[PDB]
Design a protein around this ligand. Structure first.
Ligand SMILES: NC(=O)c1csc([C@@H]2O[C@H](COP(=O)(O)CP(=O)(O)OC[C@H]3O[C@@H](n4cnc5c(N)ncnc54)[C@H](O)[C@@H]3O)[C@@H](O)[C@H]2O)n1
Ligand SMILES: NC(=O)c1csc([C@@H]2O[C@H](COP(=O)(O)CP(=O)(O)OC[C@H]3O[C@@H](n4cnc5c(N)ncnc54)[C@H](O)[C@@H]3O)[C@@H](O)[C@H]2O)n1
Ligand SMILES: Nc1ncnc2c1ncn2[C@@H]1O[C@H](COP(=O)(O)O)[C@@H](O)[C@H]1O
Ligand SMILES: Nc1ncnc2c1ncn2[C@@H]1O[C@H](COP(=O)(O)O)[C@@H](O)[C@H]1O
Ligand SMILES: C[C@H]1O[C@@H](c2nc(C(N)=O)cs2)[C@H](O)[C@@H]1O
Ligand SMILES: C[C@H]1O[C@@H](c2nc(C(N)=O)cs2)[C@H](O)[C@@H]1O
Lengths: 195, 205, 205, 195
């Protein structure tokens, strides 16, 4: 799904071999096979590597946890909020990676929006009423409050995930994402659907 | 979940446990509402059936996952193809395979058998890129016999939803042919196939 | 009669008059009791439809009558293929073709297209005698596109029973493709096909 | 359906080119395609020619006649009863031809037997009760009293008809069929099914 070029990889230095030109080709291939961009996922270097080359896979633990799903956000500033959780590195923290997440255009009618706050008790009955069955999410996704999206694991596991061209800063490190660092070629590829 | 409601399913020689035509109809309708379309049957031995259903389809020029729109073609593979670990050859199960409706433009069809010399270039012509198949599929005549078989490229096969079939395999006739009268009418009625393209893909609208 | 009860049938652009899924189910069951088995669809223009249904199928190495097990393949021929006498090109009709169950051992199947060089000898090998087909039939891939088409030899074709289908052709989309959702489920459920032999016929038991 | 040899034909002299050896091959081909012998049909020379080469076809007249069908008999002596009806020829009458009639083995469950006399009013309600619908016969046949069989026209028209090897006599002419003239090779091919 990565397009033509050399072996892609993740480093604090940056995703090696990933150009916005390469992004553009890969995005086009995906659109030709009916996949749609639904948001960003920010995570640490080796998690990105696992997702991009191994695939989005759920844990075999906490199978009945009500709010389980794969979290993404339309806003890269939001997703940018995520990188190294492994605080030791010596008290150290690395910059992680931002990834783009795609789902089949036909799964869109299972995507819901609520004004309630996700993963809060009160939002539970509302979401079960939107989704059509008891939680957890299956082949559905829910959007709610800045906005974040959770994909039911059965949906999360069938997505196509490729690297983003918006790079992470080490002199920053999870937070105030520099708007001027988001390539505009990518900005014009990152519109979200309505739910 | 994709198996609807009614307890846990299990594959056994006597037949798939807790699975009924009524429970198939439900799971089917739930999949349709979430945008999935049925594209064929996959026949396999007991243990591959349980794994694929509760674990998922998981992975050469022609590498990919085989399914058949005609239940009868998938039926011949629904049994052990050599004695298992305990020296048994027994009946297996038929699985129903689903893919997103939006993936249908990646499915093509050819009159050539994939063993045919000109097949590789004919396929790369329809698919629009070099083999192996990615998010594409090709349906064509089986090498010997004429029935049509479909190969889903691995990227696509790992994103399918597979549920059990209600068409049973006979333990008193292992290796036997599919008696079409044993296919529940409720299931035949829900197994029409999509028309696949015979011409290369035009740039998307 | 083979059309069951409910008044006289007629083929028109708005659809086959006095024909319903319920009336198809009846005629079908009556044919089964008299030993006939459904083997495919035949798509044609209005006037050939009325003639074949109320007059019968009636008659080169490859001479015979074409039908398709896949309603979608027969649908592309269900319309005028050139302007008629009044300069019109309009939608036609789909017909269901039946043959005696005892004739099934004369139906064979090949992975070869009948345009293929080795096809004539391969067919005469399965059929057991020189072409043209007599009380035999061959099902194989269409020359371009991969779908399977069946040719019934003329002696066999003139002994079929043909009744109308409940799958309608669209007058607002002449030449369009078959929307599989317009095929009544009651009809899909009664259209399984028999398994044809891929090996020559063994001397009868 | 005639087998290998020269062009077959009908004459008072005899069916030209028809040997019991040719009969045997043709019978075998038919049996390999699921057809079964159900009886003989005796008729005049040019009717035989029409049936054998043109096919069993009904008249477009008397469409609602209750007892309409194609008459055959298991017994060739019975069928032998038929030949030239065209009595003028000069008051003359020719010998006709005996033919063998086959139907798909799968049509056999639509074949009924009654002890009542066919084409007699009284037999009507009984036959409609055997056949499952009002007369006339469609894809059915009825056997009844010496025994004769009538095939509904829809069935009659889908039969395969080939010449018999039992020849007609001009010094006889419709009637007392000479038992010694029925080839035994054919006698062993002419058993009827039960109904
Ligand atoms: N079996 C069918 O439904 C089918 C239809 S057409 C067909 C024929 O099979 C031929 C190829 O056979 P092969 O043995 O080389 C195929 P392959 O070697 O890929 O077979 C893999 C086997 O492992 C099974 N398996 C177990 N677990 C999984 C899992 N989790 N995910 C995916 N697969 C799993 C598969 O069902 C299959 O039985 C084709 O050329 C074709 O003609 N098979
Ligand atoms: N039409 C289909 O259902 C169908 C399925 S596959 C198919 C394709 O059609 C190609 C051949 O086409 P063609 O035009 O040469 C065939 P052909 O020349 O035999 O066509 C005869 C036409 O006259 C019609 N007709 C009218 N009355 C009768 C009657 N009473 N009995 C029989 N036929 C009657 C037929 O339906 C047909 O429309 C095949 O190679 C095959 O690929 N057609
Ligand atoms: N293969 C993977 N699939 C999904 N999430 C992963 C994977 N590997 C690492 N992760 C990360 O683990 C967290 C999600 O898992 P969970 O704690 O079960 O929600 C996020 O930081 C993911 O980015
Ligand atoms: N093509 C034919 N099909 C059926 N019967 C025929 C045909 N040609 C001549 N006949 C004869 O006509 C009589 C049957 O027709 P009907 O008077 O309608 O019963 C019998 O003598 C038949 O042998
Ligand atoms: C798994 C955790 O990730 C959060 C989120 N992660 C992202 C991301 N990683 O891009 C967006 S929201 C959820 O609130 C959970 O705390
Ligand atoms: C059509 C007529 O033929 C008679 C019969 N004809 C035959 C035959 N031709 O072999 C057997 S019974 C019926 O009684 C009708 O009188």
């Amino acid at each position: 799904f990565l397009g033509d070029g050399g072996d892609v990889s993740f480093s604090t230095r940056g995703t090696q071999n990933w150009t916005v030109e390469r992004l553009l080709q890969a995005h086009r291939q995906l659109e030709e096979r009916g996949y749609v961009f639904v948001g960003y996922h920010g995570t640490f270097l080796e998690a990105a590597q696992s997702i991009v080359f191994g695939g989005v896979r759920a844990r075999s633990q906490d199978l009945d946890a009500i709010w389980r799903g794969f979290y993404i956000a339309g806003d890269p500033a939001l997703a940018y909020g995520y990188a190294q959780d492994q605080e030791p590195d010596r008290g150290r923290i690395r910059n992680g990676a931002l990834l783009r997440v795609y789902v089949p255009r036909s799964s869109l009618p299972g995507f819901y929006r609520t004004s309630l706050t996700l993963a809060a008790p009160e939002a539970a009955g509302e979401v079960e009423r939107l989704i059509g069955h008891p939680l957890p999410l299956r082949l559905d996704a829910i959007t709610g409050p800045r906005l974040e999206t959770i994909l039911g694991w059965p949906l999360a596991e069938r997505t196509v995930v490729i690297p983003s061209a918006i790079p992470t800063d080490p002199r920053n490190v999870g937070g105030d994402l520099d708007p001027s660092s988001i390539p505009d070629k990518e900005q014009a590829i990152s519109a979200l659907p309505d739910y």
